[PDB]
Amino acid sequence: VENATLARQALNRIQRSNILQSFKAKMLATLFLLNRTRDRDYVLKFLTR
Amino acid sequence: ANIFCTFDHKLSIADVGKLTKLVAAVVPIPQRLHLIKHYQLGLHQFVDHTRGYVRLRGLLRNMTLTLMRRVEGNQILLHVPTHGLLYTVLNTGPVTWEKGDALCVLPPLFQWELVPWIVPMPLALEINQRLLIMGLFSLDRSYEEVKAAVQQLQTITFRDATFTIPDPVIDQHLLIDMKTACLSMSMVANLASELTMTYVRKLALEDSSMLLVKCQELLMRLDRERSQHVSPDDEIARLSALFVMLRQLDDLIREQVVFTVCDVSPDNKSATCIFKG
Amino acid sequence: EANIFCTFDHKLSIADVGKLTKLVAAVVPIPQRLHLIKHYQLGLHQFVDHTRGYVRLRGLLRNMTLTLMRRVEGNQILLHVPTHGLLYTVLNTGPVTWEKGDALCVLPPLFHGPLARENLLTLGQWELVLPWIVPMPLALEINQRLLIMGLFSLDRSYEEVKAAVQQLQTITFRDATFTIPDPVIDQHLLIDMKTACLSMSMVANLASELTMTYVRKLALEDSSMLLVKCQELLMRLDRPQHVSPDDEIARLSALFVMLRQLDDLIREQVVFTVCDVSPDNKSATCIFKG
Amino acid sequence: LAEAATDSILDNPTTYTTSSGAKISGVMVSTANVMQIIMSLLSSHITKETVSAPATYGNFVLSPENAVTAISYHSILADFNSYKAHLTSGQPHLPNDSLSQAGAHSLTPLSMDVIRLGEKTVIMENLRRVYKNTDTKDPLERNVDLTFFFPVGLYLPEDRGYTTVESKVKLNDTVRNALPTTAYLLNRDRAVQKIDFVDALKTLCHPVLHEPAPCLQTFTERGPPPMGGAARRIPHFYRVRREVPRTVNEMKQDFVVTDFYKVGNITLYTELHPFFDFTHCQENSETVALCTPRIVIGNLPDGLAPGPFHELRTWEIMEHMRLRPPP
Amino acid sequence: METHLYSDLAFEARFADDEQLPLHLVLDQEVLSNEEAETLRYVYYRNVDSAGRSTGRAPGGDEDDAPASDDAEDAVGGDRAFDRERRTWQRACFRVLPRPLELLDYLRQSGLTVTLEKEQRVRMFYAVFTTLGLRCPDNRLSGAQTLHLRLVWPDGSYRDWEFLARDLLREEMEANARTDEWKGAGVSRLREVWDVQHRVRLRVLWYVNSFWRSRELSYDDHEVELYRALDAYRARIAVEYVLIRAVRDEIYAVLRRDGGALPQRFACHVSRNMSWRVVWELCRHALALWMDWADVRSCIIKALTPRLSRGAAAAAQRARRQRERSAPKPQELLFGPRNEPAEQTWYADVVRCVRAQVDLGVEVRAARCPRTGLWIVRDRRGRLRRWLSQPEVCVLYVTPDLDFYWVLPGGFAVSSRVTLHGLAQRALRDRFQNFEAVLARGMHVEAGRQEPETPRVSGRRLPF
Amino acid sequence: HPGFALTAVRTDTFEVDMLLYSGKSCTSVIINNPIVTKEERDISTTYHVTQNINTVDMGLGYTSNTCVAYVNRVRTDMGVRVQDLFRVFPMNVYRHDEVDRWIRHAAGVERPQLLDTETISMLTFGSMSERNAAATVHGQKAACELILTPVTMDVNYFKIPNNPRGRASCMLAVDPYDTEAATKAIYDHREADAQTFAATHNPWASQAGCLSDVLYNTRHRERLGYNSKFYSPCAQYFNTEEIIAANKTLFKTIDEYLLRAKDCIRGDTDTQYVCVEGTEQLIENPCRLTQEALPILSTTTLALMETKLKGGAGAFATSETHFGNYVVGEIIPLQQSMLFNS
Amino acid sequence: LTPVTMDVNYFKIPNNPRGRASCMLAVDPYDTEAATKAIYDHREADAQT
Amino acid sequence: PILSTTTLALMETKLKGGAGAFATSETHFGNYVVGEIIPLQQSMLFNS
Amino acid sequence: MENWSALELLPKVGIPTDFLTHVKTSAGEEMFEALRIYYGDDPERYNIH
Amino acid sequence: PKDMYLTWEETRGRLQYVYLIIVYDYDGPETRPGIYVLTSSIAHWQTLVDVARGKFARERCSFVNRRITRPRQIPLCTGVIQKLGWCLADDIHTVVRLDNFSVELGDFREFV
C-alpha cells in the first residue's frame, strides 16, 4: 500500500528491488511489536496503518 | 470513384447482350474523368500500322485501369479499383490462371471496336523478352538457321497455350519504336562494355575492396576473349547518353504487378483477386 | 496510432496559427512514428546542415515517415499519418508544375535560385523548412544528374569539373530553373558508385555476341538522326556462328536483373500519385501513403 | 508558508465562507501519508467545520458584438457593453471585471476539515480518493534527484597531520592502515559497502582517458597568454655568457603543496592532464603547443604529488612484499 | 593485399601502351609519422629516365629551356609548363592499414602463401600499401633509371623521395581465376631498399605469379649512364642551393654598388650613443651562418611557391593592369561602380649569432603604417614580433614577388631583387611547383566552400 | 595506491511527497462541454471524447508555493557500481589489437561494438547497449568520476557542499545577460574564485582542455563518437554552453528551473537511461540551479565507520579525521533518519 | 566456510548464509535460465553486496 | 545474526551496558563481536 | 507587439495590488512576460490611428 | 526459430519492421542456401539494401567468383528480400515468436 503496485501491474526490476528493500526493512523493524514498544501513540498509528 | 461512359451512337439489343457478357473486364482510360465519351474507351484510339507493341506497352503505363461494374442500355458503370480491397475480374486472355498468380496487363497482338490481355507475370515477361530477341534477329533473316531460331521463337509452351506470336519485322522493315528499343539495348551493352574499363580505374583510386579486384579480373577476361585519356565533354556525353537511353527501358525491365489472385471460378472464366496497383 | 500530436515551446500569436492554417494538408517528415513529438523534431531543420551534403539529406529524408497537417487547436498541432492507397489532399509549397495522372516523390529542398528562403513559420532559433514535392521526371533527372556529376568529378582538377558543373547544375522543367547546393562526395555516394560499377560491369559480361554488334549492323543499313548521334560517340569509342536461343534468353534474363539493379540506384519509390489538380497549382488530391 | 503567499485578485467574499464569517484564506493538499502525520501531530488545530461552496459552474455568456469583433479582428474584449458605456460616459473605473459577475447565487454546504494558523484558515485536503485503484500515479509523488559526491584515495599532509579521535579508535601501526586507498559508503539499508580502485576498472582503462587530441585542439585555440660534433662542442656552448630561460616544467616545482592551487601561481594554465605535460615551447620563432606525455608518475609536479607522498607509497610497496622490516 | 593484386592486373591491362612493370611496396614509421599516415590523401610517382628528363614530356627537346626570363607576367613560362608538369606524374593506387602488425603474419591471415630464404621477423607500427610502375621504353630496361615519390596530405603539403631503379632490381634480376592462383603462388622474397640519400628505407614484395616474371626483359647498368644520371640528379638537387648562392652574390654586389652607406626601410627606434662598429661586425659573422644552414624549407623557396601555381600568372597580369591605368575621370566616379593591398604575407629568415639557432620559415604579415611609415612586421596575431630590436639577430625578408630585403638590427635594410636567371626552368618546376587539388572522398565539388572534417582512416576507431 | 585520487559523483532519485499550498481563487479555471469525435473500427467503435481546459493565472507573483516534505524510499541503490565507460564510447579501441584484448579481459567488457550511423540513430532514438542485470535487489545505479590530484584539500572542498569542478560555476553569481563575464568566471585562471579564494581546486578538472572537459562536455563528446542514451551525473556540471545559455535574470532562471530544466531518467530499466521526450515522469533536479553537489558519508577505514554507527543521533553530521584516515560527514542527515522512519 | 571471509559486512547484517542472493524475487518471473544464471554462475556478480 | 563473541571480556562488557548494548557490534584486534539486528535478548527476556 | 495605448485609455478596474517583492525589482528582473516601463509622462498613449 | 534470427541493432526501436532475406552461398561447388529472418527498425528498402551489401560482402565475392569460374553456368540470383510486416519492441519474447504481428506481404525484391 506504500507504493501503488496492485494486481493489474507488471514489474520492472527496479520496482521489485524497492519492494524487496521495504520487505526486509519492515520484517526486521516491526516483527515483534508489543514486546518492544509500549507507547500508545505508535500502537495507534500501527493499528490505523 | 465512379466513371460514366456513354454512346452518342445507337446500340443494338444483340450488342447489349454482347456487352453485358463483358460484365467485369478491364478497360484502359486516358484520364480519370467523371464523364467520358466512348472514343476514349479501350485501345482503338491508338491502333495503326506503325506503333506495334513497344508504343502500346509504353503508353499503357501512364494510363489508368478501370473495371466495368454494370451495363445500362445507354451508359456503362466503370468502377476504378482501389488498393487493398479485392475485386472480381474476367479472364479475357487466352491464358488460364492458377491460384497465387501475379497478374499483368498487356495489349493484345494476336467504325470503332472495343479491345486487353490479362496475362500472369512470368508468361508476360518471357514473351516480352522473346519479342525483344525476335526484334534483335530481325535485320538478318536471309539465313536459314536464324530462321529456324525465329520459328522456334514463335511458339511458347504453357498449359493450354499454343500461341503464334506475330512477326515484329514486316516487309523487311522493323517498326521504329522496337528499333529504338533494341538500339537502346545494344548501346547500353556497348557503352557499359567500354566504360567500365576506364571507370574501374577512375573509382579504385579510393578505398578498394576485393569486389573491384574481381571486377577488373572479369573485365580482363572479357577484353582478352574479345580482342582512356578522354576529353571531358565527350566523356560527359557518353555517361549522360548511357543513362538517358537506359531511362527509356524502365517499361521493359520491370513488371508492374497489378492483381494478386485468389480462388478461381470453375472453367476459369472469372477469378476473385486483390488489386495491388 | 495514426493521429500524432506535436506541442510547441513558444506561445502562439495570431499570425503563427494563421500560417499554420495556411499549411492545412501540407506535408512534413517525422521520424520514428512517435505518438507525441516536440517541434524540434518537426520538419527538417533538426537535420539540415549546409556544407554537409545533399546526398545525405536525400537519404535520411526518405527514411523519416511522412504525414499531413490539419486541425490546429492551440499549443498543439495534429498530424495524421496516411495509410496505403487512400485518397488525401496535398498542398504543395515547392513551386514545381503539377499535371494530372502524374507520380510524385519527395526531395530535400534544393534552393530555388533567388534564395527565397521562405521559412513560412518564424521563431527564434528554428524554422519549419518544408520538403519538396516533385514529380517523378524532374526528381529522376535530379537523381541521374547527381550520380553523373558524382561520377565525373573523380580524379579531376577543379577547372574542368567547374566548367562542366556550371552547365550541369542547371535544369529546366516547364519553364523553371534549379541548382544543387551541396553536391559533395559522400560515403553513401561512393558506395552507390561502387554498386553502379559492379552492376554495369556485370551487364558488360552478360552481353551476347549479337547484341553487342546490333548497332553496327543498323549503322551499316540505315542512317537516321539518333543513329548518327549514337554512332558518333560509338565511333569515338572505337553472319552469326551459333544460335542457341535459350542461352540468349538466359543471358537477357541476367541482363534484365542487372539493369533493374542499375536503374534502382536513381529511381525511387513513387510515394504520391495525383488524381486532379487545381489550376492555380496550390493543392491537389493524391492517392497513396507517405 | 501560509503568510508568504500573496492574496489573489478576484474579490470573492461570499464564496467559500465558513460559519461566523471566518473566511477561507487558502488550501493545502498532499498525499494521505503526510496528512496522517500532520493531523496526528497537530491535534489542537483541526475541526470538522462545513463551508458553503458554490454548487454550479460559472456560466459566462458571450456578447454578440464580441462575436462580431472576434470574426473581424481575431480578438475578444470581455464585457464589451460595460466598456462601451463607461468609456463614453466618463468614469474610468469599472465596478467589476468579467469573471466576478459569474459563479455565484448557489450555495451548498460540505464537510471538509480546516486548519487555523494565526487568523489564516486553510482547507486541508488529502487526495487519495481520486487515485486509489487508478493506473496513473499521483503528481504529488514528485521525483527529486540529488547529486552526491565523495573523494577516494586522498592524501592529507604530514606536517599538519593530527588525530581528533584518540580515545575512540586505535589502529595497528601497519602502513596499509596509515595511507588511504579505499572508501566505505552506505547502501539503502545500513550496510557498509566498499569502493576501492579495483572496482573503477570499467572506467580507468578506457582509451578516451589516454587520448589528448581534443585537449591539445582546445589548448592551441587559446594559444599563449647534430650529436656527432656535440662531444667537442660541449665547451663551445659555454663560451657565450648568456643564461638560459627557466622552462615551464621546472617552474612547477618551486611551489609548496598548499599554495599550488592559488592564483599567485602562473603555470596552472599548462596543467591540463595527469598523463601528459602540455606546454608552450619555441619552434620557428613561434609559440607552439607541444603536447608531450609523462611516462612515469615521478614526472608529476611537487604540489600535485609531494616527496613524502612517494615515500609513503614506497612504504606501502615494501609492505606488500612482506619486507616492512628491511634487512 | 588489396591494392597489390588489383594494380598488378591493371598494369597487365595497361601494359601495351606504356610498358610499366609493377613494384609492390609497403612503408613504415621510418617513412612518415603515424599522424601523417592517417591522413595521407593520395600518392604521386614519376618515371624519369637515365637522361633525366621525364616520361611525360617530349622525347627530343622541350619548350622548357630559355632558363628563367625573370618575369612576373609569365613568371615561369606561363601555365602550359604547369600542365606539362601535371602530366608528368601519375596517381597510383593506395591503401592504409593504420594498426601495428607483423607483415608475414598478416599475409598468413590473408590467403597469401609466404616462403622466404630465412625468417625475418618484421614488426612495424602501421602499414600503407602502394604499387609503382616503372616504365621500360623498349622491352629492355636501363639500370640507371630513377624514380620519384610524392606524398600528399589535404593541406597541400608534399614530400619527395627519390631513388634509382638500380637498387630496386639489383638482386632480383640477377637471381631471375587469377586471384586464386595468385594467393597459392604468393611471395618469393622480401627486400628493404634505401633511397638515393639514405634518409629512408622501405620494403618491396616480389610475387612469382606476377606477369613481370614472364616478360623476359633485359637488364644492363653501364657506368657512363650511371655517371650522367647522377649528373642529372645533381642539377635537380642544385636548384634549391644555387638560388641561395644567387641571393648572396646579390648582397655583395649592391653593397659594393652602394658603398657601405645603406638606408633604413623599417620602423625602429634607435640610439645614437650605441656603438655601430659592433653591429657591422655581427653582420659578417652571421651572414655566413645563414649559408651554413641553408635548406629547401626556407623563406625564399616559400616566396616562389605561390608564383608557380595555376592561376598565379593571369592574376599577376591583372595586378599591373589595375595599376597601369588612367586616373578615374569625372564622368566615371559619379556613375561607374565602386573601384577597389592592405597587408601582405612576407616570409622571413631569422638568424641569431648569440646561440647559432636560425629559424628558416616564418610567416610575417607586414604593412605600411601611417605618417611616412617605412615598413612594420607583425605576426598572424598582430603580435608585432619584435626580434629586430635585439642586437643578437639579423633578418632577411622576401615578398610574394621577387623583391628582397636584408635587414640589420635597428631596422636598417638593404633593398634589392632576387635574380633567378641562372636557373633553368624544368628543374625550377619539379622541385617546388604548386600542384593543384584533385577531388577525392569528402571533397566539395565546387571550388572551395566550408570544407568538412578530414576522412582520417585511423586505427583509434573501427573502419566502418 | 597509484599517483592520483579520483572523486566520484552520482545521482540518487528520491520519491518524495510534496505538500502544496495556494491562496483562495489563485487561478480561474475555464472549462467547456465535452466534445465527441467518432473513430470507427471493424467491430468496435472508439469514441474520443475531448473536454478543453483553459487555466488563466490570476495573481501578480507566485501566489502558490510548495515544499519537499516527506521522503519514503529511494530508487537508486546508492551504491558504488562505477559507470560503464566502455559503452558510452563504444568506438574507441586501443591501437594495438592484442593489448586491447588484454584490457578487455582485465576489465569486464567483452568486445567493442560498432556505433550506429546517422539514419539508424535517427530512426532509433538511442542505443541502450548495456544489458539489464538478472537479479536487481537494490535498484538502478550510476557512478561517474573525475580524476583529481591527491593533494586536493578536502577540509574546505569536501565537508561542505561544493561544485566538483573546482570552480564555483553557479550562474546566478554573474551579472545577467553577459557572455564574456561568465566565461571569465568559469574558465579563466588569472582571477580569484567564488566560494573558495584560491584559483582552482582540481586543475585537471576546471579549465577547458582537461580530461573532464573532453570526457563529459557534450560538445567535445559530439566531436568524437559517443552514446547519447546513457545518462551521466557530470552532464549538469560540465555542459558549459547550456549554463552560459542559462545566464538570465533570476526570475527567468526560476521559470527555466521549474519548467524547462526538469531532467528525466527512465525508471523501468536496470541502468540510468535518458528518456525519449520524457512525458511519463519529470524528475525535479534542484542541483542544476545551484551547480553544486552534496557531500555523502565516506569513511576511509572500517573502525571509524564502526564508531560512526555506534553513536546516537547527530553523529553523521560530525567529521572526525585520524592521521591519514578521515570521515567526511554529510551536510544533511538523510542516512540517519530516512530509513529509520522508512 | 573459509576462515578469511569478509566478517565486517557479511555477518553483522542479515545475509544469506550460503553467500549469494537467492531471493528469487529480484529475478524475473517464469525465467529459469536467468534464475540459474543469477544463482549459480560466478561470471555474474552477486546482486546483494 | 545472533550475538556471539569470541572472548569473555567482550561478553562481560555487553552484560554491563546500559540499554541496547546487545545491538552494538564492536571489534578488538582478532577477537570480535557479531552484533544483534533485533533485540531478542532484551525484549522476550526483559518482559520475563 | 502589444497595444499599450489600450491599456491606458480603457476604463480599468480597481484592485489592491500586493506584490511579493518590490514592483520595480520584479520589472528589472523581468518576471512578467510583456513590460512597458517608462518614466515621467509619455504622450505615446494619444496618437490614435 | 532463434537460429534464423539476426539483426545489426540492439532491438529497442518502436516500429521494428521484419524482412525475410535469403542468400545463395557458392563457397562450396554446389549452391548453399542460407535463409535468415531479419528484423530492423529501418523501413526504407534501398538503405536496407546498402546495409545488406555492407554486411554480406563474402556472398558477393563468392557470387562473382562463381561467375568467373563457371561461365557456362548462369547465376540464378545473389539475394532476395521480401517484407512481411512489422512489430514492436515489446512484441518479442525469447524460440522468439511475435505476439501481435501485422502482416504486410509485398514482393520479392532481389539484389546482387
TrEMBL record, chain B:
InterPro entries: Herpes_capsid_2. GO terms for cellular component: viral capsid. One of its GO terms (molecular function) is structural molecule activity. Keywords: Capsid protein, Host nucleus, Virion. Pfam families: Herpes_V23. This is Capsid triplex subunit 2. It comes from Human cytomegalovirus. The lineage of its organism: Viruses, Duplodnaviria, Heunggongvirae, Peploviricota, Herviviricetes. The gene is UL85.
TrEMBL record, chain G:
It comes from the Viruses. This is Major capsid protein. It comes from Human cytomegalovirus.
From TrEMBL, chain J:
Signal peptide: none annotated. It comes from the Viruses. This is Capsid triplex subunit 1. It comes from Human cytomegalovirus. The chain holds residues 168 to 290 of 290 of the full protein.
